[PDB]
Design a binder for this molecule. Structure first.
Ligand code: HEM
Ligand code: QRP
Ligand code: QRP
Length: 399
């Protein structure tokens, strides 16, 4: 341990590291840190106003910060050895410029919102018939996110396939708790799974994104097997632990705020505003979005050299009191500036409409059912240690 902070801050539960607020209030708008996993130098931004400037500046490149050899917070590269790890660009190069936005945008959500809301209701109606303590993680979030992944993303996976992909995601998308080789092997297993099965999965009936990608028109040649497999890996890493982690976290927020839930029960028209406040208030990533300077530049007076990587903690910015009065209060009626739960600028979450859809269905399922409560104190919830995307092991609950 030295005088420069190592990153990340080990805040694996919903309790955000106090270090973020300390850095926000310091005199440095951009703070040098060192990656615990690699020893690489990095910059860290925690103020909302600085983050807006960073994430809207085209001279900072997200893709450059994903390339092999970039200074990085993650201990192992987020790609199988020998692969590009460049899924969005490979789809763009094949001529599939829009298929991601097409399969996740408003028209796609209109196709899926019915069964998603019906399934949220079916799952919660089943819990309403249960005795004693039930687990919202295993018996609500798991089946709902599994259906999302199968029906909207990958196709009809078997339970063995789903468990394999979920294990790969949890093992690879981690700062600690597993060996280096275990993490590299997780990325290899996932890629080889999609080299073997992506064509078959894209051919199963439905409208899942993997099928849309495999069946889409292309400029020049047919989409390569490597590219389709890279698409499968992207959909897993971007859609699976994010959705499962966020839905678990959002449930915990709701259970810890019964007054807010009672309000949503009385005023269902307020549910969309509650979804937005959950995206601000509920922490998800334990790391940061990041961008590489493509040329020497200045941000809030701090000189960044070409090739250096600047991180923004979305959690830190979402809890910035310069942007959100009483930032650590869950306040669905809040009328603050735009939150950072989906990022900002060019790379704003392309799945944001689908995520909002599933979050809303979950909030409505809870709000319609008075009496749901956490069965244990929030400090007794057990958290998976080191995941990029926070997730509790279980959410014990009763009526
Ligand atoms: C509540 C759930 C989710 C949250 C909170 C979330 C959040 C985010 C955020 C903050 C980013 C920006 C990363 C950056 O700026 O570097 C992002 C990007 C992305 N998200 Fe979402 N996401 C969620 C669900 C999903 C789902 C279900 C999909 C389905 C495919 C998805 C697909 C993507 C992709 C492909 C990107 C990368 C965009 C790029 O790098 O240009 N996300 N997400
Ligand atoms: O599409 C990308 N975008 C960014 C951010 C990101 C979005 N979702 C992620 C999930 C895990 C890690 C990073 C991200 C990224 O770092 N990428 C590495 C793997 C996917 C690729
Ligand atoms: O934890 C991470 N977060 C994403 C960005 C992100 C922040 N919040 C998110 C929410 C959903 C998806 C991506 C993000 C990322 O780029 N990473 C590189 C290595 C660690 C990993």
């Amino acid at each position: 341990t030295t005088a420069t902070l190592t990153y990340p801050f080990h805040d694996w539960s919903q309790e955000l590291s106090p270090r973020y607020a300390q850095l926000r209030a310091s005199d440095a708008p951009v703070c040098p840190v060192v990656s615990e996993g690699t020893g690489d130098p990095l910059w860290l931004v925690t103020r909302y106003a600085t983050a807006v400037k960073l994430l809207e500046d085209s001279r900072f490149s997200s893709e450059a910060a994903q390339a092999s050899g970039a200074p990085r917070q993650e201990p192992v590269e987020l790609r199988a050895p020998g692969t590009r790890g460049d899924a969005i660009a490979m789809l763009r190069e094949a001529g599939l410029r829009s298929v991601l936005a097409d399969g996740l945008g408003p028209r796609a959500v209109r196709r899926h919102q019915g069964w998603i809301n019906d399934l949220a209701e079916t799952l919660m109606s089943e819990l309403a018939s249960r005795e004693g303590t039930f687990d919202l993680a295993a018996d609500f979030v798991e089946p709902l996110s599994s259906a999302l992944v199968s029906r909207t993303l990958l196709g009809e996976l078997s339970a063995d396939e789903r468990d394999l992909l979920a294990h790969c995601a949890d093992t690879g998308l981690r700062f600690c708790g597993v060996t280096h080789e275990e993490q590299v092997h997780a990325f290899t297993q996932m890629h080889e799974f999609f080299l073997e099965h992506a064509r078959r999965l894209a051919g199963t009936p439905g409208e899942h994104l993997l099928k849309l990608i495999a069946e889409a028109p292309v400029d020049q040649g047919p989409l390569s097997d490597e590219a389709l497999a890279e698409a499968g890996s992207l959909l897993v890493v971007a859609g699976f632990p994010t959705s499962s982690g966020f839905l678990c976290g959002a449930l915990l927020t709701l259970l810890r705020h019964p007054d807010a839930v009672q309000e949503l029960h009385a005023h269902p028209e307020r549910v969309p505003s509650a979804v937005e406040e959950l995206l601000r208030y509920t922490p998800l990533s334990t790391g940061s979005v990041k961008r590489m300077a493509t040329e020497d530049l200045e941000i809030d007076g701090v000189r960044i050299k070409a090739g250096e990587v600047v991180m923004v903690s979305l959690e830190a910015v979402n809890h910035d009191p310069d942007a959100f009065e009483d930032p650590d209060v869950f306040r669905p009626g809040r009328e603050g500036p735009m939150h950072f739960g989906f990022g900002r600028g060019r790379h704003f979450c392309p799945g944001n409409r689908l995520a909002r859809c599933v979050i809303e269905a979950t909030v409505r399922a809870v709000a319609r059912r008075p009496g749901l409560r956490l069965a244990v104190a929030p400090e007794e919830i057990s958290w998976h240690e080191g995941l990029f995307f926070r997730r509790p092991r279980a959410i014990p609950a009763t009526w």
